[PDB]
Amino acid sequence: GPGAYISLNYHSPTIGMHQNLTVILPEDQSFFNSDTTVKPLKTLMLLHGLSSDETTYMRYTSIERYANEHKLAVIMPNVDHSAYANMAYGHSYYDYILEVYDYVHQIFPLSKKRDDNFIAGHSMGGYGTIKFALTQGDKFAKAVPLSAVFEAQNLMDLEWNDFSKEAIIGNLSSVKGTEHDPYYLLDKAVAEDKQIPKLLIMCGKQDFLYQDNLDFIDYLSRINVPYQFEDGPGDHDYAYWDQAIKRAITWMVND
Amino acid sequence: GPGAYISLNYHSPTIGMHQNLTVILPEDQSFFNSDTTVKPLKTLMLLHGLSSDETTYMRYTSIERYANEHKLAVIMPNVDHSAYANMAYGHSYYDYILEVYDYVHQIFPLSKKRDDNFIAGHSMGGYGTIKFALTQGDKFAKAVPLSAVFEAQNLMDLEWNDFSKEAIIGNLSSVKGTEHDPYYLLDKAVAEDKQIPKLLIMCGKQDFLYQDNLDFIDYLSRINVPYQFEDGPGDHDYAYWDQAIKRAITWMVND
């Protein structure tokens, strides 16, 4: 039912600047009793898409209502137009997500057990989610890409307002086969027998990335990596992501 | 040194409503390194005066700059026009301060040792400070009333905009000898051998409460309770409280 909505602005050693972060911290009885041990909460790292920021899930969905119902802490960082990369000409935004993870688990009552930690996000943030799932599989038991970009070239080549592809990839001529390519990261994770979080992939059938989502899950099936895929009516918008994140939160906290 | 500025809004079980709270949390390297143990911070509970709220210290002083310099966490709650009382007709705002104290020490990396915990505030908040110092002396090693109301009639009889004295005290003819009277609370602390935090009492010489402050320290001297009193040029305003809280923070963290 009740929780805390928290806005934090701290000077990040990784990206060299003050940066805003938002946190949903559902209430627990132990948080109000100085005689009892704090019960650490299950925790979701939740990644915004391109043009969104740390405020937009709160504004355009009812995520705090869903999170409070399931006692799930939610961490919402801001990564600008970075695509969750350590940018060639810009900020170290991949490392920044690792810093945020460590920081909030140190200063808040969040469980540090892998089974209690999840990651999710939409569009550019679903791309970010799969990138972290395949390279930081020891940190998250479950990962939920929503309406994700899996073929990196479609996001690097998109002509969105003020977006600079070169800020991210620099001198790279293509992203295929680089750290920016989720298919390469997947091949590397399997080849090196890394832990892959349990995967729930969701995408609206009217989304322009729907075919891209179908291509990725087919490849997952061909390399014997399990996943759950949920589709249905929905487009590339927060009307879909509001309903999708509600369904995702129920899925992540039940197992 | 850098820190986090934190804005929290949570549903309070004590006062039955969502309520904002602000927190300054200076940064420590242990907060970013998952391999080391988090070092708990010294903590100040800082109480606003009448017409102010949880935002006004940040807005009208440079308090976060001072706190960051001394690695001091600062907790700034909102108690409206309550005078930090469990109100006759209103909210349980005395109890709320205790709830805020417990909550932030549970969810944040704040030291729970009495020697690491301080309380301070100006005007109505200096009245609140002395009330908590004399009734919750086990929670604070030091207390700093700034420009405080010590003779409770001086606060209750004020004709400030929209302020209701009866909301606080109900039908009481006088507050002398009641839980609203710092002189009664002081006599009772002495009589019951309660621990009294170290007192630093500050007031500007042009403050209309200056004589009220001199009367209180005169009484403290007459009952052999130690204190440090600092005055000088200054009035009943945030220009004075900015400089006073700066000098107070240095005093509380040294020794």
Next chain:
Amino acid sequence: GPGAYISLNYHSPTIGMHQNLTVILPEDQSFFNSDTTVKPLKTLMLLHGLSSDETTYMRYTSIERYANEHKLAVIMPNVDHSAYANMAYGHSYYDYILEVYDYVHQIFPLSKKRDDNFIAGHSMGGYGTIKFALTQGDKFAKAVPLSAVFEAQNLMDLEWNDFSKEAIIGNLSSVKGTEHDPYYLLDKAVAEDKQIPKLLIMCGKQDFLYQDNLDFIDYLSRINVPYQFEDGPGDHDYAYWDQAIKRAITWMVND
């Protein structure tokens, strides 16, 4: 179409303290061109229920998403446990809503035309909505009480956490025939031919206030005051108010 989410804290002359307010301001191209006259937006005054505040509609609904779709500015004030009254022992919160109305229409590009201004709210805020609709009908063309208290005793006699009925009504043993009684305000508006905003009344069938809603619309029918009533599955919670305020916004903005 996106917009601005605004958090404002100003010292109120009416309530004698700093208070927080939240505003949703959808974007118009006139806002970005210094050569054109700003186009004023339709504006909704949205009132929270008991235990909520200025943040809770944003946190527990997708109201900003709905408002942006319909280019509707939304004003969300905080009135604590006041029931939108000028309190017997407390603050002038009825007058405060009038001050907020004037203030935001002055400092923001909001239409001052009656036909462009609406008011809505749930539970205690639906009680507030009907009180303002029946006493300030010249300020609002439409009013939408959601899950409202219409029989004031149902609100006052509530044993809600930390709630003080006497702070609001003083020593009164009944509220019938007073400014706290919507039925009296309705009788007085009908008798004096006041402008009554066009009325849309919504309540969930599982809400404990559902019968109170049926009683009020039954009275409206007996006295030939027009209204639209919409019910259906739903309880006394933000899951219902999220859906209801989306439906209400669509109703206000068109015809």
Next chain:
Amino acid sequence: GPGAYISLNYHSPTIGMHQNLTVILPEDQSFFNSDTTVKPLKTLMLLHGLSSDETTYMRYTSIERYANEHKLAVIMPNVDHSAYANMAYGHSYYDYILEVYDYVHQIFPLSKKRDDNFIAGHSMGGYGTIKFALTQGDKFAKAVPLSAVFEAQNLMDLEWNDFSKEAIIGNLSSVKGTEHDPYYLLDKAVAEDKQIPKLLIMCGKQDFLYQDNLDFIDYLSRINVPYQFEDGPGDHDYAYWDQAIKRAITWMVND
């Protein structure tokens, strides 16, 4: 004097993302009476330095206290590590400042007369201030660079945490004689007789940029452009900028 502190987050068409902005809006009578035309305020565009953001002036200075004393609205945008440039690989942050100027003058009661509009900022923001002063002289009657970078090479060649010079200037081997060079902007302003805002230049004597400031004012003297230069004890920190912005605000409004 009391005012509003405003935090806004809107989706910017220029930079293609949600972005936070803070505004100080001192109160005026007309703001509380909707029957009158609102009175427009004098307005200052205040630009942060490297590693700061839209929150840091509020947090580390008492700027709102100073602004309220002089009924000066203050606009504090966020421009990250951009150096206020339209970045070679990044965002169009020069255009963004112009968008913010137009946006806040449309939606808030801000005077559009050149004589009522000022710009100021420290370090990277002092560099930004002089760039806008020399290229947008029709928008600002006065400009106040604080501890500014005037020799652009010292900012671009800085080795600050996560800072990318290439993101700003691309492969350029020097910035001399370019739009990133204040001396070139100065020569072109003088050559084309464009109006130069009245200049107040301040820097602390212990600042590592002090000589850079001395070089710039010497050049202004040699090309017969007036200025007032104020130095004194002070370093490259917010202890200095707090006192400097207080002195600057008194100068701007008094004219």
